[PDB]
Enzyme design. Structure first.
Site, PDB file in Angstrom:
ATOM      1  N   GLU A 163      72.868  59.976  22.096  1.00 23.26           N
ATOM      2  CA  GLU A 163      72.691  58.840  23.017  1.00 23.26           C
ATOM      3  C   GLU A 163      73.429  57.573  22.606  1.00 23.26           C
ATOM      4  OE1 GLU A 163      68.723  57.917  24.210  1.00 23.26           O
ATOM      5  OE2 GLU A 163      68.346  59.939  25.017  1.00 23.26           O
ATOM      6  N   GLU A 350      67.267  66.753  25.969  1.00 23.85           N
ATOM      7  CA  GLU A 350      66.026  65.999  26.086  1.00 23.85           C
ATOM      8  C   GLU A 350      65.597  65.999  27.553  1.00 23.85           C
ATOM      9  OE1 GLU A 350      66.901  62.701  22.509  1.00 23.85           O
ATOM     10  OE2 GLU A 350      65.395  62.128  24.044  1.00 23.85           O
TER      11      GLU A 350
END
Length: 446
Positions: A163, A350
């Site tokens: 991320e 995720e």
């Protein structure tokens, strides 16, 4: 048995969030160890000192994963455990720990998928300016090589970065993450660039090692949509997608940065200090990525500045009804990625739901989470039938863990951790459900 056997069902954690043992066995201090102890930065002044104590209880936790019939565990290595100061002397007790975590997963036939950097940078390198300094990018490839050499005979699925959007965005634009800098956009785009450099270079190093696993980066996937049919709003969405998808996904998959946004950084005096050597490495190793990781939670619906703001004004996000759910949003998002990047191999690395889990008679009946996962799993099933190349699902959070910001409050995950009873673990309702979903290979009517 609808999902294929080369598709992995898994769950995920991150080091600082689960591990604890913050000053044990030669672990260096990191940026988050310092940042979380600055008063007012983290909920209740919560600490990654102990976290959920996963360092000491790993054998137990992996057992529960085994009992879940988990196919894959995605976890992060703590850089400060392997190389305490970021470079220099390797720490043999960090290598001992991760070897044990890996071997344990493997006892039970659980596939380690390792994340090299999940935000927990050793402090020296933060004080060097972290991701705004090429140095930190060069230190990372050296660290990555150390992990490959130490763990790559067993670990065959590797993630470099989790991320980038967040650790660069939150640390230089919103100042919510270390180093705590606000609206310094040129530093933000610098950070992203040296990270995309460290990645493509690390990928080159990996292929040279001839370990024959797979390697890729994991981004936020935040597909963006016009709040309606208005042209000025559709323009805002394209803009949104350029900055929030194409800037992140183009350099790694295509090897070129996207010209729309490059043009605009030049025209604003925001272009990062980039060199031809760097941009070439990035170019040359884009075709070397084996997959892309997606961390998908929600889409964003957008309208233009005149019509929650974006860091360059221009658009804002709006809550409405046609935090957000949208299985429809996720699916159209996936096709949007196939048009541009081709039949690229995808891991939804995720996806899950943060919640104040309902408790009844000491049982955790987290049916929101089950319903969240079921909805996304369902459309991934559609996506695969519609041609998308999805080869794994990692529910965000195998085990309750320390949020960065929100301490303990919004549970994530399948294993509950009891803060009132010496951090004792307990299966939640989602644990039993997901086990069945793994065993059925996702036969919930399609």
């Amino acid at each position: 048995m609808k999902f294929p056997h080369d598709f992995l069902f898994g769950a995920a954690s991150a080091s600082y969030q689960v591990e604890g043992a913050w000053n044990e066995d030669g672990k260096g201090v990191t940026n988050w160890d310092e940042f979380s102890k600055i008063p007012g930065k983290t909920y209740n002044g919560t600490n990654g000192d102990i976290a959920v104590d996963h360092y000491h209880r790993y054998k137990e936790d992996v057992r529960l994963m085994a009992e879940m019939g988990l196919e894959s565990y995605r976890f992060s290595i703590s850089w400060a455990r392997i190389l305490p100061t970021g470079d220099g002397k390797v720490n043999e007790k960090g290598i001992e720990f991760y070897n044990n975590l890996i071997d344990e997963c493997l006892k039970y036939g659980i596939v380690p998928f390792v994340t090299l950097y999940h935000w927990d940078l050793p402090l020296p390198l933060e004080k060097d300016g972290g991701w705004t300094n090429k140095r930190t990018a060069e230190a990372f490839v050296k660290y990555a090589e150390t992990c490959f050499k130490a763990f790559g005979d067993r670990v065959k699925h590797w993630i470099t970065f989790n991320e980038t959007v967040m650790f660069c965005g939150l640390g230089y634009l919103k100042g919510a993450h270390p180093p705590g800098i606000q609206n310094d956009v040129p530093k933000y785009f610098q950070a992203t660039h040296y990270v995309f450099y460290a990645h493509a270079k690390t990928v080159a190093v990996y292929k040279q090692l001839k370990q024959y696993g797979e390697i890729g980066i994991t981004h936020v996937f935040l597909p963006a949509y016009s709040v309606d049919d208005q042209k000025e709003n559709i323009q805002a969405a394209n803009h949104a997608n350029e900055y929030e998808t194409y800037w992140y996904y183009d350099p790694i998959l295509k090897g070129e940065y996207p010209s729309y946004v490059v043009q605009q950084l030049k025209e604003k005096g925001w272009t990062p200090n980039w060199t031809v050597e760097e941009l070439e490495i990035i170019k040359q190793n884009a075709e070397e990525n084996d997959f892309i990781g997606l961390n998908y939670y929600q889409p964003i619906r957008v309208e233009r500045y005149d019509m929650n703001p974006s860091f360059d004004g221009f658009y804002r996000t709006v809550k409405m009804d046609d935090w957000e759910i949208s299985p429809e949003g996720f699916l159209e998002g996936l096709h949007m990625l196939k048009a541009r990047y081709g039949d690229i191999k995808m891991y939804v690395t995720e996806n899950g739901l943060g919640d104040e889990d309902p408790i009844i008679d000491g049982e955790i009946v987290d049916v929101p989470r089950i319903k969240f996962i079921e909805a996304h799993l369902k459309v991934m099933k559609r996506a695969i039938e519609e041609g998308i190349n999805l080869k794994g699902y990692y529910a965000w959070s195998v085990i309750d863990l320390l949020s960065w910001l929100n301490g303990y409050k919004k549970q994530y995950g399948f294993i509950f951790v009891d803060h009132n009873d010496n951090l004792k673990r307990k299966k939640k309702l989602s644990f039993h459900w997901y086990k069945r979903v793994v065993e059925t290979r996702g036969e919930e009517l399609h």
